[PDB]
Amino acid sequence: KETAAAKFERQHMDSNYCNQMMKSRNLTKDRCKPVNTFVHESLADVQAVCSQKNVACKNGQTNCYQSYSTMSITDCRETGSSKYPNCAYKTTQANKHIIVACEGNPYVPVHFDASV
């Protein structure tokens, strides 16, 4: 079964598109998930964010880190009409700074906190 680091990679890394990829990565095979972000950078450059700018997470914990540069991301957002089993997503491409929460040794991303 997956570690938190593995789940982050399956759900968010990818070095209409949202309907296809949300299904492919087992996010909407048995539920419709409201929002998810995919990052189109290399895994190692996303892992590198865990030693970049330390910031507080949305929940006030302090193990979150913001990337120095913007990264290519696709936001997937359920339409107002979406209902299981027919999940439906709005796809929005953007280049944004990402904020991830990191844990473990190696210190790697385990949650996507936000993009800016």
Q: Check which CATH number belongs to the domain holding 86 and give it.
A: 3.10.130.10
Annotation-wise, does 58 bind a ligand? Answer: yes
How far apart are alpha carbons 50 and 84 in whole angstroms?
35
Q: What is the resolution of this structure in A?
A: 1.6
Alpha-carbon distances of 115 from 42, 46, 58, 97, 106, rounded to whole Å: 17, 13, 12, 5, 23
- Domain count within the chain: 1
How far apart are alpha carbons 49 and 52 in whole angstroms?
5
How far apart are alpha carbons 18 and 3 in whole angstroms?
24
Catalytic residue (one of 111, 112, 113, 115): 111
111 noted as active-site residue: yes
Q: Which domain holds residue 32?
A: 1-116
- Residue 80 CB contacts under 8 Å (≥ 6 apart), including other chains: none
97 noted as active-site residue: no
Take residue 15 and report the two structure tokens written for it: 């070095």
